[model samples]
Target: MPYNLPLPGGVVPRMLITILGTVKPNANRIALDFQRGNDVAFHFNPRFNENNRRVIVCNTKLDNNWGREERQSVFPFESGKPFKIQVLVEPDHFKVAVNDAHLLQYNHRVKKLNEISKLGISGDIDLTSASYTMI
Candidate 1:
């Protein structure tokens, strides 16, 4: 199941997003999304079981068509452990941090950052907390 939250006035530069959670012991995957209407501007995915290895995949979905999938072979979070994921929206891109460590930098796929009104999260994990603010 996925959880979706509405952002007032949508997102803009300096917007900070924090999602804290614990990955399920038997989990296979997890994902986060920034959406507007029917389009997803950003997709953050951490796959726990792929080719017998852990992987992180990030991409964009515009009008339902998937964009290039960027993959990270080395995983960061451990199964059954808690993790903190943060995203700082910038003028030209987004900076991500996982457990206070740098994760990935994703350039803006859609021009209007304020157009993204929904924060989406789903996967085999328990959400501890989620918050958004202007930094």
Candidate 2:
């Protein structure tokens, strides 16, 4: 369940990344990672069982160490449900939306943004479409 795609232009500001998928039946979690070499610029996770309440987790990893975790309480994803995730690249942070609704944002940790060549996705969702474009 991992597809690390080579992003063209390497994630510039105003770029849009759209991912469409369906959460597996009784799925517990899903992950979307933007990776640069061994470091993760962004780690976006949807956790269905966090404290027995749905939540979304976000963070960054540099040098094999994960930074402070950021989470959003309004969980927009559900097991057995279809999802459309959109991430807009910004000047200082990434704006995320799910199913056309604003979800969350994360600041850049890996400063050389253009070198973030690969976007890797994993976990309990069946991805039907995942692509990025300048917009």
After superposing candidate 1 on the true structure, give the runs of residues whose Cα lies further than 4 Å from its correct spot.
Answer: none
Q: Over the stretch 25-61, how does candidate 2's per-residue lDDT look in tens digits?
A: 9999899999888999999998999788888889999
The prediction achieving the highest TM-score against the true structure is 2
Clashing pairs in 1: none
- The C-alpha stretches of model 2 lying farther than 4 A from their native spots are none
Instruction: In angstroms, give how far residue 34 of model 1 lies from its true place.
Output: 0.5
- RMSD (Cα, Å) for all candidates, in order, is 1.0, 0.9
Q: Any residue pairs clashing in model 2, and if so which?
A: none
Instruction: Find the candidate with the highest lDDT and give its number.
Output: 2
